[PDB]
Design a protein around this nucleic acid. Sequence first.
RNA 1: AGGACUG
Length: 184
Amino acid sequence: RKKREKEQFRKLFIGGLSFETTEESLRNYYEQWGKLTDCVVMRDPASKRSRGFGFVTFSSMAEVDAAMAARPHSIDGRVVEPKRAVAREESGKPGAHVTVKKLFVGGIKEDTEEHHLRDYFEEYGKIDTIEIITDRQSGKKRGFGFVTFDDHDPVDKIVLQKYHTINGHNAEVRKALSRQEMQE
RNA sequence: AGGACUG
């Protein structure tokens, strides 16, 4: 009992496709977990060579959830790297295409604690680590911490739903990137 | 990390 979400929430980027992968075989594969609305494998215009990547659009985000839960994916004898897609409009933010397991979580003030985060974020995946940042040499809480999962996808899914309310607070949740966000 | 490079 949902409406269609906007496209960005239903779209998958598939990296590391084999050269013999086509739209029909990619579509065949991802149709196991949902109805495909669009499917495209990007080619060199001159050579018509596959660029080794593509995009599938599911009809609901739930189907993306299901397909991601089914990993790993072998399409044409090669394990592919599927990720929630990055909008054309955000493709050039620093660190846009970088896959990480570490979630940033700010906006939490001083009353928020590891158990609030665990309890809240448990429902997205297996957590490895939770660290609430206290001040170096004061122990004063700094308003933020880091959740690290065993997989990148809970992070991506979390950040895609950008609105999260935790311990009463509006939390800022982003990826925790080092200066790996340096690319031109 | 995008099809219309069909601007």
